[PDB]
Amino acid sequence: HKSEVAHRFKDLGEENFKALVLIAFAQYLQQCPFEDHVKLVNEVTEFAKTCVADESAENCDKSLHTLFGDKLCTVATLRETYGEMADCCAKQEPERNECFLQHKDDNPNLPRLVRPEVDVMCTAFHDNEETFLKKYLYEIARRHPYFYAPELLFFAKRYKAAFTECCQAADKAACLLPKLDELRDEGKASSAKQRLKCASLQKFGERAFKAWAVARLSQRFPKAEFAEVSKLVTDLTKVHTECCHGDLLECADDRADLAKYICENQDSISSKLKECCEKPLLEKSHCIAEVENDEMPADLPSLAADFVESKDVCKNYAEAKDVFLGMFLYEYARRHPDYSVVLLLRLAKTYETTLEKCCAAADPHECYAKVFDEFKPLVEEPQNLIKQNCELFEQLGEYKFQNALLVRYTKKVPQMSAPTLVEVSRNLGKVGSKCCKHPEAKRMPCAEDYLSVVLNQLCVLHEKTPVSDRVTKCCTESLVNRRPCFSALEVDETYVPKEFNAGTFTFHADICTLSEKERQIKKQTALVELVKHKPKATKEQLKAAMDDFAAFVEKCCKADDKETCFAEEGKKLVAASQAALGL
């Protein structure tokens, strides 16, 4: 093909092509206004059409990143608006693309998305359906710059279908808002999972991602042979490498080929695919990704035979170490569909470490004969953790559970700012309502899986503006041990505590007028600040000081001269807080 842009336009069709190009622009240039992006996207698409008519026409041979980068840099050279993105525009491909990817903002400071009334949304939809759907893609993509782009196409199709049906219903809001809430929740989950895929591929590499994919596909397709899993994993690694590198047109095209491959080879993969493989393209790919696990083979041997007992263990390992560990992961994972994949990966890493040491040793079989015993604690630690946290959660309820995690993470990472710690503790605390409500047996896998994406979100942000060396170590050492690494963090004794002074509690009257979700964040911020004045403070010390804080606020917000009360009482709270903390 003498024109990649023509090739992708042909493979994908104009509707998906334009939607993916808009996603790409919105994810690279998240601060750019909607109307500017639609203009650029439309220019790109008309150009693409001239290349389809004539792949030899001028510039039809250029790489997608050359064409798309050039469009973006017509507006992103303005440092006032786009910051360091202006320096990316100073470079050429391929350096330019990597620079844009480095500057994708995982924490864009963008307005909360307030749903208008349903009647108003339905009128906007009816008044201009295409623009309405493009705005949807744009707002989600720019807030989630690694959202899995081909799946976002399917979200948009469902979003359109919800409006089509519900805007003509008798009770519009009761048809529509449940559907929009389900999509929004699904989207948050999808986005978090994809961010971890991209982090694995970009920071840890293809082997790390493939280990993940082998484990996960082996759970879902336990009757597939290892060679078939390996083929699917290779296919899927290219799809996600391309999406995570910003190659969205290629990603979508390759994802469609993978879904067709799967649907044409169901008998080698799984018996659960028939219905998925009868749907149209986007529903098909979505259905394949969500389908339920096949039943595992009826009578599997123990793994002892091949990975413990057999005489050639170290022989097979040394001639193809990652293939042998892959087969270990495939055999272990297909037998344990209810395990979290990251735990499976820790088992495979333990096994690897044991074979690395023992196959050098005098009598390997005796050095590694008890290797499977090493797995028992790896399962037990996570289960105790989530047991403790769910008990705490059920005792305390949502807000106080968050406050306990806020204290724990301030003690671990006091170099973070209060807003960061509040947000971390909020995200961690959702593990409460997401996982502690499940049956006992499903609580630990849910929690390991959810914590992996929460910690990864913290890690990708910390990497750009690091403030704790201990966080940097936990984030960069080994992906699969991140959660245990963070759990083991004790109070950071290197942190120099903040000193109390007459202005430690300086407030204005504006706090007396707030909504007590706003007042809740003030209290949480205060709890962070107290810990920072005494990292080793006890729960009793903290409760005493926060009770003082709350009485101080109630006193001054009733007062005739509020600013004066705050000036006169702030320093009294300082003295009482010091005492409460033992100084």
Partner: protein
């Protein structure tokens, strides 16, 4: 260049005998930034003083607010005492109780 400090002493709230308050010693317009400030009660140095961050004005001269919690009484005399390279001897400014 060198610049001599200006020194002002005043309370944060209007003083009333026996009522807790704060006394400020505001030192401004000086260069270089090395400076020594004590607040005094009946000629004795007060330990429990704090200060805002040393900062500077558009003309690049430095300023510094020292302050201390205090409970004035009829008989007590308060002062601010400043030393700086530009001064032959420490300069003492007495709190004037808002009567200049």
């Amino acid at each position: 260049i060198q610049r001599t400090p200006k020194i002002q002493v005043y309370s944060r709230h209007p003083a009333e005998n026996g009522k807790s308050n704060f006394l400020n010693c505001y030192v401004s317009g000086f260069h270089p930034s090395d400076i020594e400030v004590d607040l005094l009660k009946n000629g004795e140095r007060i330990e429990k003083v704090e200060h805002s961050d040393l900062s500077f004005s558009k003309d690049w001269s430095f300023y510094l607010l020292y302050y201390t919690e205090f409970t004035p009484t009829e008989k007590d005399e308060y002062a601010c005492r400043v030393n700086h390279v530009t001064l032959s001897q420490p300069k003492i400014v007495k709190w004037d109780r808002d009567m200049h």
